[PDB]
Amino acid sequence: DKLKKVLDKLRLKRKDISEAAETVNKVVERLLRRMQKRESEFKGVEQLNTGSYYEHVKISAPNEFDVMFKLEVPRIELQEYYETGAFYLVKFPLSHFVLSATKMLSKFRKIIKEEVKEIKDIDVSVEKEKPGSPAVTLLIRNPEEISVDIILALESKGSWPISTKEGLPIQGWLGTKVRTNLRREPFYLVPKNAKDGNSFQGETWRLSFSHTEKYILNNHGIEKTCCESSGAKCCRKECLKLMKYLLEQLKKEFQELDAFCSYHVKTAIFHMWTQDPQDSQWDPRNLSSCFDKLLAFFLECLRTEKLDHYFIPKFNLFSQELIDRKSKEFLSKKIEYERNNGFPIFDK
Amino acid sequence: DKLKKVLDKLRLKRKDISEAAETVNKVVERLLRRMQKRESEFKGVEQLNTGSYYEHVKISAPNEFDVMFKLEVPRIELQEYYETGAFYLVKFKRINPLSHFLEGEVLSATKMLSKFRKIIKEEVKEIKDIDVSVEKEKPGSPAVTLLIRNPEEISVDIILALESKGSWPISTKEGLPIQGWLGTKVRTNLRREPFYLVPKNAKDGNSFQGETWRLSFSHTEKYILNNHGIEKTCCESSGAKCCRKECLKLMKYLLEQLKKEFQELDAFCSYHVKTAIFHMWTQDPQDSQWDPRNLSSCFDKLLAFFLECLRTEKLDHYFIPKFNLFSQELIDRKSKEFLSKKIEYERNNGFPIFDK
DNA sequence: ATCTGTACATGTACAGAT
DNA sequence: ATCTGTACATGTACAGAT
DNA sequence: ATCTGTACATGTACAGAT
DNA sequence: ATCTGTACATGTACAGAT
Numbered sequence: 001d002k003l004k005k006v007l008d009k010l011r012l013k014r015k016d017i018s019e020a021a022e023t024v025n026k027v028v029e030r031l032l033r034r035m036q037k038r039e040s041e042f043k044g045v046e047q048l049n050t051g052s053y054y055e056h057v058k059i060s061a062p063n064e065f066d067v068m069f070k071l072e073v074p075r076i077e078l079q080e081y082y083e084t085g086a087f088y089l090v091k092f093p094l095s096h097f098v099l100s101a102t103k104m105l106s107k108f109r110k111i112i113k114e115e116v117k118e119i120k121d122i123d124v125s126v127e128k129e130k131p132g133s134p135a136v137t138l139l140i141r142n143p144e145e146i147s148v149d150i151i152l153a154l155e156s157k158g159s160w161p162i163s164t165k166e167g168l169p170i171q172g173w174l175g176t177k178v179r180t181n182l183r184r185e186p187f188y189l190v191p192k193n194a195k196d197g198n199s200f201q202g203e204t205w206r207l208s209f210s211h212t213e214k215y216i217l218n219n220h221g222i223e224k225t226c227c228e229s230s231g232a233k234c235c236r237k238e239c240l241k242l243m244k245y246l247l248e249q250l251k252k253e254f255q256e257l258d259a260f261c262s263y264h265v266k267t268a269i270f271h272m273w274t275q276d277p278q279d280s281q282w283d284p285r286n287l288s289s290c291f292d293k294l295l296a297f298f299l300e301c302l303r304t305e306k307l308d309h310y311f312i313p314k315f316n317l318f319s320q321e322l323i324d325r326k327s328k329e330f331l332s333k334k335i336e337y338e339r340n341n342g343f344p345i346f347d348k
Numbered sequence: 349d350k351l352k353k354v355l356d357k358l359r360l361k362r363k364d365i366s367e368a369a370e371t372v373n374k375v376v377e378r379l380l381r382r383m384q385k386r387e388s389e390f391k392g393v394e395q396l397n398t399g400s401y402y403e404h405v406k407i408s409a410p411n412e413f414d415v416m417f418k419l420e421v422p423r424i425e426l427q428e429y430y431e432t433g434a435f436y437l438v439k440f441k442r443i444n445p446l447s448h449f450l451e452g453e454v455l456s457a458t459k460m461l462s463k464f465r466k467i468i469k470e471e472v473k474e475i476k477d478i479d480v481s482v483e484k485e486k487p488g489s490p491a492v493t494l495l496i497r498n499p500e501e502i503s504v505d506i507i508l509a510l511e512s513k514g515s516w517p518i519s520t521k522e523g524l525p526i527q528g529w530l531g532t533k534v535r536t537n538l539r540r541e542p543f544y545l546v547p548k549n550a551k552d553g554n555s556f557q558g559e560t561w562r563l564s565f566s567h568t569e570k571y572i573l574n575n576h577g578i579e580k581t582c583c584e585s586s587g588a589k590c591c592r593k594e595c596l597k598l599m600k601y602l603l604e605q606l607k608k609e610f611q612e613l614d615a616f617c618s619y620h621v622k623t624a625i626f627h628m629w630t631q632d633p634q635d636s637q638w639d640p641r642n643l644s645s646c647f648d649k650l651l652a653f654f655l656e657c658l659r660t661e662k663l664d665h666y667f668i669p670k671f672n673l674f675s676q677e678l679i680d681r682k683s684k685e686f687l688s689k690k691i692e693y694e695r696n697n698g699f700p701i702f703d704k
Numbered sequence: 705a706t707c708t709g710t711a712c713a714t715g716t717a718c719a720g721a722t
Numbered sequence: 723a724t725c726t727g728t729a730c731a732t733g734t735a736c737a738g739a740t
Numbered sequence: 741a742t743c744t745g746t747a748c749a750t751g752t753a754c755a756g757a758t
Numbered sequence: 759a760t761c762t763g764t765a766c767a768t769g770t771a772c773a774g775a776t
């Protein structure tokens with residue numbers, strides 16, 4: 001009953017959705033026109049909306065949108081970077097850029113920046129570049145703050161890379177036929193934009209499966225009718241919203257959690273949805289225990305420092321390399337607290 | 349257990365499948381290629397395998413294959429034929445390799461099927477690989493049937509079909525009621541696929557005889573047959589087996605055995621049983637209502653449902669609700685009471701016709 | 705020289721065979 | 723149990739055409 | 741090629757019923 | 759308290775026109 005009340009808070013408002021979407025769509029369509037309405041290196045880029053807002057798991061406000069500008073590029077050879085699973089060198093218009101992610105991202109970025117300068121009807125700027133982000137991030141005020149991540153992606157139509165061969169383990173949940181079809185779709189690569197000082201960092205790209213995650217989010221039941229008008233409701237998305245909320249509220253309070261992101265929560269719940277495939281295990285009457293066993297799953301990842309990429313199982317998002325052991329223990333204490341106290345942080 | 353053994357008798361042998369498919373694909377692919385020659389009016393037709401063999405509900409032997417030779421026709425107007433829901437006049441909007449089959453803008457089924465058949469016939473006359481001839485034309489059939497003596501006899505229906513990519517006709521708006529079974533996203537995607545028209549070709553003498561076309565949903569039925577569960581994993585390697593197709597096979601076989609003996613049953617065809625079980629699958633959506641352990645009672649309820657259709661003279665087309673395949677104008681009560689009595693007798697006596 | 709309809713190439717669910 | 727032939731979806735090569 | 745038109749999925753919002 | 763039915767809204771796939 002508590003959680004019902006929290007989920008009412010987190011719910012987006014129809015007016016808010018309409019006002020933010022109409023302004024976001026204005027800007028994106030404009031950047032999009034430019035990318036081909038010019039002999040630029042990215043003519044033929046197409047738009048693909050991704051992330052929480054388009055998955056309908058955005059919470060609180062419609063203030064963050066993700067758009068992929070995917071560029072179909074033929075006959076490319078991947079090279080796995082030092083067995084990371086998820087990072088690759090790319091080889092063979094674009095010959096102004098081995099295809100360097102740094103080089104291509106910044107011309108891409110230069111074009112956006114120029115169009116934003118010529119937008120006089122919307123208050124929009126380009127956020128200062130962040131290392132680690134494959135994005136160009138727009139900041140819009142109308143007057144509400146909305147940020148848009150414009151993600152550059154290459155699109156390849158061959159077999160998925162070998163490191164994914166054992167990924168996407170939906171066989172007992174969404175099944176083999178959905179899995180085969182999903183793997184017939186293209187796969188995508190985005191810039192790994194670290195500044196860490198390590199080796200081929202500048203030319204590395206990372207795999208993206210945002211398009212596969214979108215289908216899963218909107219086709220998430222074992223029954224075809226799950227969450228449809230002639231089916232039952234499940235509380236799978238509500239659990240994702242609640243667990244996202246918990247991590248958001250925690251990161252607001254604690255700088256020690258800067259190394260965590262929503263994608264960790266998302267990865268965790270894909271694993272939970274695979275471990276517990278039956279729609280009846282996510283009955284809306286069992287929201288509380290569903291949320292709890294999610295919390296317990298998330299804590300078990302922290303405890304064992306193990307949260308494998310749902311699509312690239314050798315890639316540990318919780319390795320010591322990326323997140324310090326101290327950071328995970330901090331987060332375990334705070335979650336264990338919120339859990340055993342009826343979630344005080346949910347009341348603010 | 350008794351029905352388990354009938355299924356084994358009905359099971360196709362991989363060796364038979366291999367030999368029959370090898371011949372069949374040879375002929376079909378050669379026919380499909382002639383269609384692509386010359387100023388052949390049918391240039392651009394594409395192949396669509398449909399029917400029981402490609403749904404894996406073909407029984408006893410692999411001796412009848414159905415293939416659609418479909419031709420996309422854009423900018424099509426339809427006129428429903430006398431509110432029957434399923435039959436249409438095809439008209440065009442301009443003044444086209446189908447020119448030779450036009451009347452008053454009206455596209456002739458009987459004309460265009462004749463040319464299609466003449467081309468097949470000629471192409472077959474050439475085949476000296478295989479003992480293959482073209483059957484005498486059957487009234488009411490949209491097909492050009494090949495009889496292959498492969499030693500073993502093998503029928504192939506080459507079905508001529510127009511392909512329109514627009515929305516399906518209003519007469520189907522209330523059809524295909526899979527919302528509580530396969531759901532709304534599947535229904536929306538299925539109805540985004542093309543719809544098809546095949547020649548009615550009746551020769552009954554009624555007005556418009558040779559220009560009426562009949563809707564076809566073979567392509568939708570193939571999808572349904574192979575994605576038949578409320579659960580995405582139904583019959584998959586990491587899911588539970590159902591007995592949905594097993595019930596279809598047993599019903600098909602009961603109608604086949606009877607049809608083989610008694611010619612009173614000539615108005616009946618396997619599409620009747622196919623349509624009846626789509627309704628049963630809708631009525632009983634859950635995969636647990638089709639547990640392999642309960643094959644006996646699933647087959648029983650399908651028989652009881654079919655019996656009620658026969659008595660009440662009512663079996664609605666699954667895609668065209670207002671079209672009644674068991675109407676008095678199509679099959680007389682006397683033919684349905686005869687089949688009713690034969691089904692009750694097989695039911696209540698241990699299905700002795702399964703032993704013949 | 706480049707273009708492109710045809711057909712090989714690849715991968716796997718389905719279900720028969722062992 | 724695993725092995726395995728057919729059908730089928732989609733990616734790609736290239737002889738013959740422009 | 742680009743773009744509008746169409747259908748209906750996913751939502752939110754609220755009154756009346758249970 | 760929740761459930762149901764209608765209204766209101768945005769996103770998305772694709773046919774078809776220009």
Ligand SMILES: Nc1ncnc2c1ncn2[C@@H]1O[C@H](COP(=O)(O)OP(=O)(O)OP(=O)(O)O)[C@@H](O)[C@H]1O
Nearest residue numbers: 050051052053058059064066208209210213262263
């Ligand atoms: N580390 C990552 N690895 C792979 N994909 C990622 C990663 N981070 C984000 N993504 C992809 O980009 C999408 C957008 O990420 P983002 O940070 O905006 O969060 P989100 O899932 O959209 O939700 P929210 O913005 O509400 O926190 C993700 O849904 C996922 O598809």
Ligand SMILES: Nc1ncnc2c1ncn2[C@@H]1O[C@H](COP(=O)(O)OP(=O)(O)OP(=O)(O)O)[C@@H](O)[C@H]1O
Nearest residue numbers: 398399400401406407412414565566569618619622
């Ligand atoms: N009377 C009909 N009305 C509508 N569609 C029909 C009709 N008869 C056949 N069809 C369609 O054509 C297909 C082929 O028909 P056919 O009579 O060969 O039977 P089948 O369903 O393939 O099975 P079997 O040949 O094993 O008896 C059917 O699956 C169905 O889609």
Ligand SMILES: [Mn+2]
Nearest residue numbers: 051052064066
């Ligand atoms: Mn987001």
Ligand SMILES: [Mn+2]
Nearest residue numbers: 064065066149
């Ligand atoms: Mn983002």
Ligand SMILES: [Mn+2]
Nearest residue numbers: 399400412414
């Ligand atoms: Mn058949």
Ligand SMILES: [Mn+2]
Nearest residue numbers: 412413414505
């Ligand atoms: Mn047939």
Ligand SMILES: [Zn+2]
Nearest residue numbers: 226227233234
């Ligand atoms: Zn659901």
Ligand SMILES: [Zn+2]
Nearest residue numbers: 582583589590
């Ligand atoms: Zn099944």
